[PDB]
Enzyme design. Sequence first.
Site, PDB file in Angstrom:
ATOM      1  CG  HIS A 147      25.831 -35.884 -38.635  1.00 18.71           C
ATOM      2  ND1 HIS A 147      27.101 -36.419 -38.669  1.00 18.71           N
ATOM      3  CD2 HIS A 147      25.271 -36.321 -37.482  1.00 18.71           C
ATOM      4  CE1 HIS A 147      27.301 -37.146 -37.585  1.00 18.71           C
ATOM      5  NE2 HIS A 147      26.206 -37.104 -36.848  1.00 18.71           N
TER       6      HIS A 147
ATOM      7  CD  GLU B  64      26.463 -37.128 -33.044  1.00 17.12           C
ATOM      8  OE1 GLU B  64      26.496 -38.226 -33.970  1.00 17.12           O
ATOM      9  OE2 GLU B  64      25.523 -36.945 -32.264  1.00 17.12           O
TER      10      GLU B  64
ATOM     11  CD  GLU C 190      19.895 -38.919 -33.430  1.00 19.53           C
ATOM     12  OE1 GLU C 190      19.161 -39.860 -33.798  1.00 19.53           O
ATOM     13  OE2 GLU C 190      21.099 -38.830 -33.743  1.00 19.53           O
TER      14      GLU C 190
ATOM     15  CG  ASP D  31      29.987 -36.172 -40.352  1.00 20.51           C
ATOM     16  OD1 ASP D  31      28.977 -35.456 -40.469  1.00 20.51           O
ATOM     17  OD2 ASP D  31      29.901 -37.391 -40.102  1.00 20.51           O
TER      18      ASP D  31
ATOM     19  CG  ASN E 145      23.789 -34.389 -29.523  1.00 17.79           C
ATOM     20  OD1 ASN E 145      24.238 -33.272 -29.769  1.00 17.79           O
ATOM     21  ND2 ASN E 145      24.166 -35.476 -30.187  1.00 17.79           N
TER      22      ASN E 145
HETATM   23  C1  LIG Z   1      25.244 -38.861 -34.247  1.00 18.29           C
HETATM   24  O1  LIG Z   1      25.314 -39.597 -35.464  1.00 18.29           O
HETATM   25  C2  LIG Z   1      26.404 -40.532 -35.431  1.00 18.29           C
HETATM   26  C3  LIG Z   1      26.111 -41.638 -34.419  1.00 18.29           C
HETATM   27  O2  LIG Z   1      27.218 -42.545 -34.388  1.00 18.29           O
HETATM   28  C4  LIG Z   1      27.070 -43.679 -35.189  1.00 18.29           C
HETATM   29  O3  LIG Z   1      26.027 -44.522 -34.714  1.00 18.29           O
HETATM   30  C5  LIG Z   1      25.858 -45.746 -35.447  1.00 18.29           C
HETATM   31  C6  LIG Z   1      27.140 -46.558 -35.401  1.00 18.29           C
HETATM   32  O4  LIG Z   1      26.970 -47.747 -36.150  1.00 18.29           O
HETATM   33  C7  LIG Z   1      28.292 -45.748 -35.973  1.00 18.29           C
HETATM   34  O5  LIG Z   1      29.505 -46.463 -35.795  1.00 18.29           O
HETATM   35  C8  LIG Z   1      28.392 -44.425 -35.231  1.00 18.29           C
HETATM   36  O6  LIG Z   1      29.370 -43.614 -35.817  1.00 18.29           O
HETATM   37  C9  LIG Z   1      25.936 -41.004 -33.041  1.00 18.29           C
HETATM   38  O7  LIG Z   1      25.535 -42.003 -32.113  1.00 18.29           O
HETATM   39  C10 LIG Z   1      24.873 -39.904 -33.167  1.00 18.29           C
HETATM   40  F1  LIG Z   1      24.566 -39.301 -31.948  1.00 18.29           F
END
Ligand SMILES: *[C@H]1OC[C@@H](O[C@@H]2OC[C@@H](O)[C@H](O)[C@H]2O)[C@H](O)[C@H]1F
Lengths: 312, 312
Positions: free
Chosen positions: B205, B233, B127, B235, B169
Amino acid sequence: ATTLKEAADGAGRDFGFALDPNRLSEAQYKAIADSEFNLVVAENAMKWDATEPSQNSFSFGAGDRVASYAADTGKELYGHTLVWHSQLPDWAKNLNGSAFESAMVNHVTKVADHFEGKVASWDVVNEAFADGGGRRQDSAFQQKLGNGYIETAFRAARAADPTAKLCINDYNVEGINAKSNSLYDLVKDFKARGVPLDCVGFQSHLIVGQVPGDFRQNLQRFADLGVDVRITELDIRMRTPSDATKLATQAADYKKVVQACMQVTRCQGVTVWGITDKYSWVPDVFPGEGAALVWDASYAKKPAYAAVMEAF
Amino acid sequence: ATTLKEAADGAGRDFGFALDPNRLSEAQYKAIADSEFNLVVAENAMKWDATEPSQNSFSFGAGDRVASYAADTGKELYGHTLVWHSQLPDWAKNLNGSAFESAMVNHVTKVADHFEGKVASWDVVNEAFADGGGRRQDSAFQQKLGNGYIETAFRAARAADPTAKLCINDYNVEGINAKSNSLYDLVKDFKARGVPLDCVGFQSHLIVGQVPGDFRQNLQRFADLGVDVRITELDIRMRTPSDATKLATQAADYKKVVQACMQVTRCQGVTVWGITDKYSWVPDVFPGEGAALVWDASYAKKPAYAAVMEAF
Ligand SMILES: *[C@H]1OC[C@@H](O[C@@H]2OC[C@@H](O)[C@H](O)[C@H]2O)[C@H](O)[C@H]1F
Ligand SMILES: *[C@H]1OC[C@@H](O[C@@H]2OC[C@@H](O)[C@H](O)[C@H]2O)[C@H](O)[C@H]1F
């Protein structure tokens, strides 16, 4: 059954092996480990020198790797020795009196606490006796702390892990003799005084054709004291190289050992000290001897395999 | 095929899930994890806040647990993010200029070095861009180091692990827009200047019924740059509660996403961010939305299951 795991499972008993985590990267090793056993123990990963290389500095890396493997493959985890005179870091051997006892108590507490819920049984004390009766004299624990060190280890272990089976382990105690007698008196005393002790481990580092004829009789007397018994580090060495007769005899020896366990209701199972002769510890300790395990250096099943199979 | 794993395997592609090691103790969770996927990634275990809680003090416990699971079950291991503005320890956010860069370089080196040989691919940078084009401004890395931080991370990663696939990513880059354009220009520049970069990850996402119509077209343009692409990721959230129509639409959305990957030869596979809706991160981040995964809170296969199955 098609595997020794199913044979042991059907008998409602454990059949484990000594794991070296660094070998899981070897395809044939992992294949056998995955399908032939239902219990696993760290060959060296959970010992004092591996878990606490420096005072208060714990390294559970390799130890965790073994625990992860057991959990991921559905095998029982056997914890190998918290207190042992061998493979003890020099810093520990340099401590004395109070400080040494506090270190022992702390090591037992931290290691037992870390694997709490993972390990089902622990070799709290390993090899505390001497061949011929009495306590071993070349032990830093016996020398610095005296007779009461073992009881202190069992009480410290029970406090750290209230549900794990706390065992005492030793070799040359398979048959009735002066060593197994001193061990018997200890177990008897501990159970009478309420000291935490649930099991007795019999290493069984035997020699081809010399399996104690009173093996099962000895196992039974301990079981009658109200504790479980187990064959912890089984391997039957011979004079290398091996031949048809030596392998035929070895096969009959493995059978006798398993049958003995099968005849004692409290015998939890059998753990062979390794998978293949290629990695067996025997040749390094017993010069000129080897070929002690069930699988040869080429990962081929030896006559002992079928014997263990039918013994279960 | 009977499982999504076989479908993915037969297609010569990856189908993974985000693992929370603490859930492996739950029978149904482990059962699905073991049989439905061929790749695994740490949901949080390998992030900066988990691996280096204090400067120079690394904690690979949970991280190793994920790696052990992959090795023990025969799944590919996907390393999740070395550099990310979120879940960054305060000590790091307090460092500046040179010191901050050295910390980043050290974190990338130590973590990549530790899992060398275990992880096949790494989300080196996660990101780095902002929705609407350009670099994100709320990033400690962008603010303290500027534009060149990403290149430094990729060069530091390649040095620590010369064989791992180094990916970049990001989210909201599935379809063609100002964000994916800035990403495209970066990949194009890195490959032209020889900067270590082998893959591009598309978070995906998504929202039910809003799958980018130019998804595959976008995936293809990146693949033409000489890099692999992957859905990292996945969903597809909806407004809770769920109903027949919402689940029917979601099923068609999952299908479109997998088909897109199947249509691009360089698309390595699809990774869903979790197994069951019961543990999905969506409801905590997107209030009022959820039911994004393939398995519901009761571990029952939803209409999306069959869709993913036939899409492969
Ligand atoms: C893509 O988005 C999901 C993220 O994973 C979350 O990060 C925050 C944490 O509190 C949650 O349990 C995770 O599912 C991931 O890092 C990101 F790249
Ligand atoms: C029973 O005897 C075997 C012993 O394990 C060996 O210890 C020394 C080490 O160098 C070898 O690799 C091991 O196989 C075990 O601790 C003991 F209880």
